[PDB]
Amino acid sequence: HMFFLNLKQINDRFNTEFITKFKEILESGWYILGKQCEKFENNFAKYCGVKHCIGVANGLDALRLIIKAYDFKENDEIIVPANTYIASILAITDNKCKPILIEPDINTYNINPDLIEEKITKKTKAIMVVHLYGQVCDMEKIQLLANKYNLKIIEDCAQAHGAIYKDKRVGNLGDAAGFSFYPGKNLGALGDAGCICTNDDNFASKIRALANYGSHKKYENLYTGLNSRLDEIQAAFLDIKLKYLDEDNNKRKNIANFYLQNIKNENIILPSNKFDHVWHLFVVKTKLRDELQHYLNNHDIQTIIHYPIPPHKQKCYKDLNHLKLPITENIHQEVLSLPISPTMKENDFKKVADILNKWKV
């Protein structure tokens, strides 16, 4: 059984260091908001080329906190792609803002920047850009729109750790960015984890407070805060793995290129990489998706759909069910993710391509 994402394979490279750092943190007696958090933050900040990195409990928290720290009014509007993972939207509604859902470009799977301005209203306060599947969004126009209409840009970076746009990294393309380090992400923890990145000193300091109960100083609560912190253990594990993140992303680039160069099947539309793509998810598109998934499973290849029901169609968002978003809806009916990881064996990726080429419907 070739697994969709073999984490033990990804992480076995680091066991001996992992155990070392664990023992160290044991030796320290310090498990929360300590020197491993500081060290990881400082390194990830350098990595994204930003001034400030605040470790938090997960990527949904990271998003929810950024939105919270802006103090928007109830029903203020945040423009967001309609085809993202639900978490992006959950962060908006958690904060009693209104998500304004924009169709993607079929050629990027990212928000179509040409479709945003028409949806901008007096209630709009932000654009949440999502670098979906690993590919950075085309920022040029979004940035112009944000300057023009006095909007914040919030990056959801949970799928594109390390992707580059012009001179900058994801995380440094907007006003503030949220990252997930859930274990299957291109930089994955061994438990839940997240961070926020920004260059603004005041904003960063406010975020630190809000993620630690609303307290800047012992005994005192300046804001109504959250408990959303990155555990020492998880910061340590992340820092060890961050050293090899670009390498890992490159190993993904190699497998994706192999897929792109070798899968030749009329029933399958392959993903393109118009801008930098770190290939978190290798997403193909076919009118016979569920059939493909079954076929692959029959050949001992596990595949997972990202994603089959779009946020507007979910039961939790009944009041959005009527929205007509046919590009999003078609994608959701048609996509399927092929196994990819930095450690994935040659024999395994060759088998995926060979079996796809044999699929004859």
Residue 343 binds a copy of itself (CB under 8 A)? no
Q: Residue 115 or 305: which CB sits closer to a copy of itself? A: 305
61 binds a copy of itself (CB under 8 A): yes
**Judged by CB, which is closer to Cl ion: 135, or 180?**
180
Residues 6+ apart with CB under 8 A from 275: 108, 135, 136, 137, 138, 163, 165
Identify the residue among 44, 70, 317, 349 touching a copy of itself (CB under 8 A): 317
Dihedral of alpha carbons 215, 220, 222, 224, sign? positive
For CA atoms 248, 173, 211, 34, give the dihedral sign.
positive
Question: What track of x and - describes contact with Na ion for positions 158 through 197 (by CB under 5 A)?
Answer: ----------------------------------x-----
Residues 167-186 that bind a copy of itself (CB under 8 A): 182-183
Applying CB under 5 A, the residues found at the interface with Cl ion are: 58-59, 180, 182
- Is 93 strand, coil or helix? helix
Name the minimum Å distance from CB 345 to a copy of itself.
Answer: 16
**DSSP strands (E only) in the chain:** 52-56, 77-81, 98-102, 124-130, 152-156, 164-165, 168-169, 176-180, 194-198, 282-285, 335-338
Q: Which is nearer to a copy of itself, 261 or 314 (CB)?
A: 314
Q: Which of 222, 300, 321, 354 forms a contact with a copy of itself (CB under 8 A)? A: 222
Tell me the residue ranges of DSSP E strands in 105-248. 124-130, 152-156, 164-165, 168-169, 176-180, 194-198
- The least distance separating a copy of itself from the CB of residue 27, rounded to whole angstroms, comes to 7
- The one of a copy of itself, Na ion, Cl ion, none whose footprint includes residue 314, by CB under 5 to 8 A per kind, is a copy of itself
Catalytic residue annotation: 185
Pick what 80 binds: a copy of itself, Cl ion, Na ion, none; C-beta below 5 to 8 Å, kind-dependent: none
CB-CB neighbours of 16 under 10 Å: 9
Q: What Cα–Cα distance (Å) separates residue 136 from each residue in 84, 169, 290?
A: 13, 9, 28
For the chain, give the residues followed by a break (C–N over 2.5 Å).
none
Phi/psi at 312 (5° precision):
-60, -20
Binding residues for a copy of itself, rule: CB under 8 A, are 6-9, 11-12, 15, 18-19, 22-23, 25-32, 57-61, 64, 86-87, 90, 93-94, 182-183, 189-192, 213-214, 219-227, 229, 231-234, 305, 307-309, 311, 314-317
Binding residues for Na ion, rule: CB under 5 A, are 57, 192
